[PDB]
Amino acid sequence: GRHMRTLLIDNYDSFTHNLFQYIGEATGQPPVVVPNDADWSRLPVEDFDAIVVSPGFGISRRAITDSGLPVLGVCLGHQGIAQLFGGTVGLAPEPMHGRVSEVRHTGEDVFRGLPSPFTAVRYHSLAATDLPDELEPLAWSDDGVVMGLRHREKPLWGVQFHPESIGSDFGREIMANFRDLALAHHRARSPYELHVRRVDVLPDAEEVRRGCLPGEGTTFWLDSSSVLEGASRFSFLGDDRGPLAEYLTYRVADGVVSVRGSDGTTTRTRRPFFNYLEEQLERRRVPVAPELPFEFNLGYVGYLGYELKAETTGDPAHRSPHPDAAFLFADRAIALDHQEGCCYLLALDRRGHDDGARAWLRETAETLTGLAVRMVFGIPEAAAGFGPLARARHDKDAYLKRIDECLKEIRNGESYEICLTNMVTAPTEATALPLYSALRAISPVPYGALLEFPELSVLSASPERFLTIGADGGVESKPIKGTRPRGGTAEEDERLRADLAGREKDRAENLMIVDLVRNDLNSVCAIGSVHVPRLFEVETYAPVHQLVSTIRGRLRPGTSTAACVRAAFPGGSMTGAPKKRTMEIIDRLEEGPRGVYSGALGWFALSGAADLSIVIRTIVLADGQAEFGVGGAIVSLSDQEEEFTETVVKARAMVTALD
Amino acid sequence: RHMRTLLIDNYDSFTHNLFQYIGEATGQPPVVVPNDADWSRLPVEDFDAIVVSPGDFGISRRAITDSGLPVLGVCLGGIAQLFGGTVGLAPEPMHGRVSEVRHTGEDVFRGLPSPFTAVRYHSLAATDLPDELEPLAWSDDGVVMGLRHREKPLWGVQFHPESIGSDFGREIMANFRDLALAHHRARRDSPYELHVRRVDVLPDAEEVRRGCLPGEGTTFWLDSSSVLEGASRFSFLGDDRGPLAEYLTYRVADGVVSVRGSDGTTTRTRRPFFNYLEEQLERRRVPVAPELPFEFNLGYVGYLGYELKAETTGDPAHRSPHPDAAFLFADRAIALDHQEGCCYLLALDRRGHDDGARAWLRETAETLTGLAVRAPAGFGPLARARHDKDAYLKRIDECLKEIRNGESYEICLTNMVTAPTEATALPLYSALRAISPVPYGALLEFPELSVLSASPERFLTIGADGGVESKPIKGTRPRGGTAEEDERLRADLAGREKDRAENLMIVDLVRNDLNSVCAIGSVHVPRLFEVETYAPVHQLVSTIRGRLRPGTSTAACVRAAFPGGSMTGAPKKRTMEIIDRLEEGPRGVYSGALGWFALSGAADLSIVIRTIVLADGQAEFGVGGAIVSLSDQEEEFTETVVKARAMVTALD
Numbered sequence A: 001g002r003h004m005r006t007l008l009i010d011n012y013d014s015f016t017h018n019l020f021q022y023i024g025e026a027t028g029q030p031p032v033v034v035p036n037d038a039d040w041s042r043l044p045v046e047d048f049d050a051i052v053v054s055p056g057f058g059i060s061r062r063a064i065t066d067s068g069l070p071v072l073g074v075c076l077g078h079q080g081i082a083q084l085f086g087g088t089v090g091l092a093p094e095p096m097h098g099r100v101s102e103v104r105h106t107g108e109d110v111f112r113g114l115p116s117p118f119t120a121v122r123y124h125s126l127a128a129t130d131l132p133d134e135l136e137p138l139a140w141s142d143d144g145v146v147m148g149l150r151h152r153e154k155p156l157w158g159v160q161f162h163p164e165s166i167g168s169d170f171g172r173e174i175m176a177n178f179r180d181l182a183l184a185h186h187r188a189r190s191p192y193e194l195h196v197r198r199v200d201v202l203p204d205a206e207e208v209r210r211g212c213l214p215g216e217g218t219t220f221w222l223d224s225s226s227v228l229e230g231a232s233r234f235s236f237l238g239d240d241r242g243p244l245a246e247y248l249t250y251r252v253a254d255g256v257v258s259v260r261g262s263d264g265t266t267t268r269t270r271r272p273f274f275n276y277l278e279e280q281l282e283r284r285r286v287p288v289a290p291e292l293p294f295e296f297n298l299g300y301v302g303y304l305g306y307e308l309k310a311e312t313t314g315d316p317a318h319r320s321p322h323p324d325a326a327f328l329f330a331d332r333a334i335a336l337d338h339q340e341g342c343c344y345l346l347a348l349d350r351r352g353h354d355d356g357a358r359a360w361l362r363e364t365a366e367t368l369t370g371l372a373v374r375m376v377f378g379i380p381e382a383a384a385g386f387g388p389l390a391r392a393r394h395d396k397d398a399y400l401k402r403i404d405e406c407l408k409e410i411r412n413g414e415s416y417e418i419c420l421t422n423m424v425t426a427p428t429e430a431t432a433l434p435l436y437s438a439l440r441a442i443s444p445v446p447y448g449a450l451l452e453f454p455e456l457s458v459l460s461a462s463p464e465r466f467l468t469i470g471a472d473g474g475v476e477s478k479p480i481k482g483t484r485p486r487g488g489t490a491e492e493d494e495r496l497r498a499d500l501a502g503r504e505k506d507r508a509e510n511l512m513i514v515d516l517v518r519n520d521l522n523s524v525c526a527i528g529s530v531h532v533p534r535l536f537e538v539e540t541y542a543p544v545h546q547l548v549s550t551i552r553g554r555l556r557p558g559t560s561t562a563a564c565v566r567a568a569f570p571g572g573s574m575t576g577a578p579k580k581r582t583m584e585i586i587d588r589l590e591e592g593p594r595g596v597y598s599g600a601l602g603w604f605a606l607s608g609a610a611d612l613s614i615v616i617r618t619i620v621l622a623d624g625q626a627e628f629g630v631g632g633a634i635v636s637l638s639d640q641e642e643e644f645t646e647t648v649v650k651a652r653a654m655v656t657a658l659d
Numbered sequence B: 001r002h003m004r005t006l007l008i009d010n011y012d013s014f015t016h017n018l019f020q021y022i023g024e025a026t027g028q029p030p031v032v033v034p035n036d037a038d039w040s041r042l043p044v045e046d047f048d049a050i051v052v053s054p055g056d057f058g059i060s061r062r063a064i065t066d067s068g069l070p071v072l073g074v075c076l077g078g079i080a081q082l083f084g085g086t087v088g089l090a091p092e093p094m095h096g097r098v099s100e101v102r103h104t105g106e107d108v109f110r111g112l113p114s115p116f117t118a119v120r121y122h123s124l125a126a127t128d129l130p131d132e133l134e135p136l137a138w139s140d141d142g143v144v145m146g147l148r149h150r151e152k153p154l155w156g157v158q159f160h161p162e163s164i165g166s167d168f169g170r171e172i173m174a175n176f177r178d179l180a181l182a183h184h185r186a187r188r189d190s191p192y193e194l195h196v197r198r199v200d201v202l203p204d205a206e207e208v209r210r211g212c213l214p215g216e217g218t219t220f221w222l223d224s225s226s227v228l229e230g231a232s233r234f235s236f237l238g239d240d241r242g243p244l245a246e247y248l249t250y251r252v253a254d255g256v257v258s259v260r261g262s263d264g265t266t267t268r269t270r271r272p273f274f275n276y277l278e279e280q281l282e283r284r285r286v287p288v289a290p291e292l293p294f295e296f297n298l299g300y301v302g303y304l305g306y307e308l309k310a311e312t313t314g315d316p317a318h319r320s321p322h323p324d325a326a327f328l329f330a331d332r333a334i335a336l337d338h339q340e341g342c343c344y345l346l347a348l349d350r351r352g353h354d355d356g357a358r359a360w361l362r363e364t365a366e367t368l369t370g371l372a373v374r375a376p377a378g379f380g381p382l383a384r385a386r387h388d389k390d391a392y393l394k395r396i397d398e399c400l401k402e403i404r405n406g407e408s409y410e411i412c413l414t415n416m417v418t419a420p421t422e423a424t425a426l427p428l429y430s431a432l433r434a435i436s437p438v439p440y441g442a443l444l445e446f447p448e449l450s451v452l453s454a455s456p457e458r459f460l461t462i463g464a465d466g467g468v469e470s471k472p473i474k475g476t477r478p479r480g481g482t483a484e485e486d487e488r489l490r491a492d493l494a495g496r497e498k499d500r501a502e503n504l505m506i507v508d509l510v511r512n513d514l515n516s517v518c519a520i521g522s523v524h525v526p527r528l529f530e531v532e533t534y535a536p537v538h539q540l541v542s543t544i545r546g547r548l549r550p551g552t553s554t555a556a557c558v559r560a561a562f563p564g565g566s567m568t569g570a571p572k573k574r575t576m577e578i579i580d581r582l583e584e585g586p587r588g589v590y591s592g593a594l595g596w597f598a599l600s601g602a603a604d605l606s607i608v609i610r611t612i613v614l615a616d617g618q619a620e621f622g623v624g625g626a627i628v629s630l631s632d633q634e635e636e637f638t639e640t641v642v643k644a645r646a647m648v649t650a651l652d
């Protein structure tokens, strides 16, 4: 998009150029330095996204009162904020010049991620004694002096210490936090009215699907079938019956978006899907409700197929037999809060209509209250086969040859890691809901989904977070790579878990994906914002042990949520590195489409938030047959037989559901 | 100006990670260009450095061979193959796997621990490097992990600095930026020939002064009277008798530069001094001679007076009785290498001419050789302080009141002491250098005054490569009468909150000065609150380093940092105004800078403390100390008396 522009107001003290260095290192951009006595009217304040007020009347006041921009006051600037809003700046208990204090804080805003206490140098005889009602203290010295404050509403922050002093710690981190706060402010800067109703019941999610949604017709169920503090909390359900609901599909080959309106009309448009999605999410922007503990305030629920790579970094090598994208615009949704044991009902009216949103709220609420009442596959059994009626696109011998081709390409330096996949097809008479009811019992996961669309049903037991994007512009990806089968005993199982956490080969497979996802996020994230808070964590699900790494970033200003997904699509954890050359190798060897498998499934909120899973451990139901993808990383250290066995093991939850 | 980096994208999935690391390390994002860009249409001239990303790749090959820019090759970034090196199969393919990397700590590896952890993404490695290439780093399985071309500004790393599993990636990208800055500063016609002769003798320095320099003439002796490894090593002596020699003075009041040539005639020019000096050093540019182990390749030797502040960030509040600048343009000089026990003789001719530089080198070498055979290596009774004790105590009171109103955090308050003396320059300096051996001793014997410096303090040491170091001193103790007293006082100096605060505020101030002229990320403090012991006092000393931005002259760096933070205090502009009001007169040479500006672009400048100025049968010496909120009036006065001991003993 673009880089953030910081204004550094020089108040003519001997600190401005140290702050210059710290902003430059923290943000990857030098700030524009302007003297405090410059002409405000002249100054292109419009061009700037964040102001740092240096220590030492003038434009400092204007910046704080008039600019409407995020401001960080450093020392005399901090006192400026306290004063300008009717505070008392009187003498501290002890004058402190070039002297060190332990600063304790709440770890909020500019103090995010800093240890309490941390060491900071002070250069003042004056402190914010009596804080106004509009300001709140965030930090205090061992001396009892206010060291940090903020305005309760406005994006204004003060520190009564020098972050940039040689005797201070985490100076750069404080400046990076302010940049992040500035980005979050500008993202926060509508054709609908969002109605919300909390119901103090939590019925069984499957009872809600069966009781509240129609058996026949287009429906979604975002299923936290595994609920675990910090990993998953919410489930979402809806249908296309609402008067503002739409069903949207995309065909890469035609390049056309087909939208079936609530009217009945299907509109057709020749353009790329991510571009289409970006336009609609901008046009339909609705702010998050502060009484909602989640950020899905309605929007699009559905899937992005692998073949959409043709409009990201990939080639249109193969045609999916399924829509390359399929989404319900959910005008009406049921949210289950599994932590608090309540439901939230969300409904849209057009800004100037009573489209029966409030009527749906009260009726669904009455329906919900009436509904409120109260495995482990080890090797070698897990690696039996794909099922009795099942045909893999590539039989064992075919797949061993593609693995061999992968090892040659790696040896010739064309790829570092190839996520080679197979596609298995099995005739079934099973309908979506009973089959899904068996799958979710077999493999409880944080990112379960049942999509029941006209052209297909998607039965996902994915545990994998592709992208979680806040309305504030915060981004998290948790690529999974490195797999170990479960043990047929609990001894063998704790062993295989330890083996996965410690083996060089699996760590290398995962690390190369972390670097790849870091690269994708760095193309759309602010410089210095991309980091890896967690490397090589082991997660255990009913069918497999998984190596998982966590990568976070913060979107650049001008970068849409849709743009972020496009840049990272398809997921590095399903392609390998380098992505463009590897996707070409996958085109040649797999000799057909992945379809929904290896794509992304989840929601884009009208708030600009998103939560997308990677489509793995998924059954696509269409035209009397079940289709499921399986695969794994091929690296120089890969054994052909072991890699094939891993693909069979990963099929086991799906094979068991269909059995 | 900031440095511009071109990042060549070789269509791999590492480019935006390298982008992030360059951005954070250098404070500027690189311009990213794909490897299939048009070379003719690409404005390579507008860029200062190339990073070749991992991955036919045209722009990459032409970056390394065709362009004369600094290049860092990352993995695929070619340099081995292009210069007739071998690319062979490594003992094991390494993709996303960590190696322990051991290195020489040179160039891109500067300041990295050995070993450090690095992630590799390659099956192929450089095996047989040609003479022109040099290995810098090796893996724990014996593969070359880093290389450089011996002449061209080309570095290769056979690992990913920017990988999550690598350490010190940002430090590697910053090191490359520093090397790029160094290279361009060394490209920047010469009106002189530089002639160098090494003589493998080392006579007594004081005998070289007596023997090789004239008694009555205008001379310099930069005297490492203390010689300690990595602290001081060289002395420099010269006179104005050469044919290309000039004597040079400035007056702030007139704004006039006075140049006395070999002719004996004096030219006068109205020009800010730092502007004139910057102009001359640009026009008189001569590259460093690599056979010289020191950076002074001849140039200007002298002092910048405190009152020059009028043309930096200060006001012209008082007129010095002495020139505000005074330099000998030394066309001939003797360098003593106290470490290797040899002498180096430097002499300028005009380009294509013979002004007798070889004759002076040959003659002076003989004189040095024969000289080395004969000589191998309170304030005082008639002293008057500008401020008596009672007056100085009340000036300290005024300082405390300014600090109470938050106008200053630290004021370097000083006194000026004057005494009649019969002593002449050389004998009195002979006494001083025995009393207080220091790394930055000097005897300047100019027409208007003699300067007898026993200064231990480094103001600015600037490489030809644009590397800057400042070692501000703040925090003083008297010497103890025993070894055990000295240990107590050294411990006490390092530990006291007051002294640590005095020092830290100058470190912050000098960081601020260097950041105005230095590359973003380059300014750091490798040592904080180190105690150094000299004959007269224990000193608390901190070290600050940076790299000059491209298009910043050495003179512009001195201007930005002058006067020294260690002699003013923070904030400098307001604090210097308080000093103007309370000191009631000029500092002159005292509290200014004394040293050399080399034709190479290098410089080495001391702070003028522990110095006697001789003029009109009168001795003048400044003494001062930090006034802070914690300052006691009596103690701060006594510190000024303690700091006078060396000068008072020498005059006595």
Ligand SMILES: N[C@@H](Cc1c[nH]c2ccccc12)C(=O)O
Binding pocket: A221, A222, A223, A224, A231, A232, A233, A234, A235, A236, A446, A447, A448, A449, A601, A602, A603, A611, A612, A613
């Ligand atoms: N687990 C998510 C909700 C969810 C369930 N299944 C999903 C599939 C895709 C995206 C999100 C989901 C949460 O707790 O908020």
Ligand SMILES: N[C@@H](Cc1c[nH]c2ccccc12)C(=O)O
Binding pocket: B221, B222, B223, B224, B231, B232, B233, B234, B235, B236, B294, B439, B440, B441, B442, B594, B595, B596, B604, B605, B606
């Ligand atoms: N100590 C310096 C030379 C030197 C001695 N006295 C000086 C005074 C000013 C500048 C330099 C010097 C060196 O070893 O290189």
Ligand SMILES: [Cl-]
Binding pocket: A530, A531, A532
């Ligand atoms: Cl990082």
Ligand SMILES: [Mg+2]
Binding pocket: A166, A167, A168, A169, A170
């Ligand atoms: Mg620190």
Ligand SMILES: [Mg+2]
Binding pocket: A509, A632, A633, A634, A635, A638, A643
């Ligand atoms: Mg594998």
Ligand SMILES: [Mg+2]
Binding pocket: B164, B165, B166, B167, B168
């Ligand atoms: Mg690291």
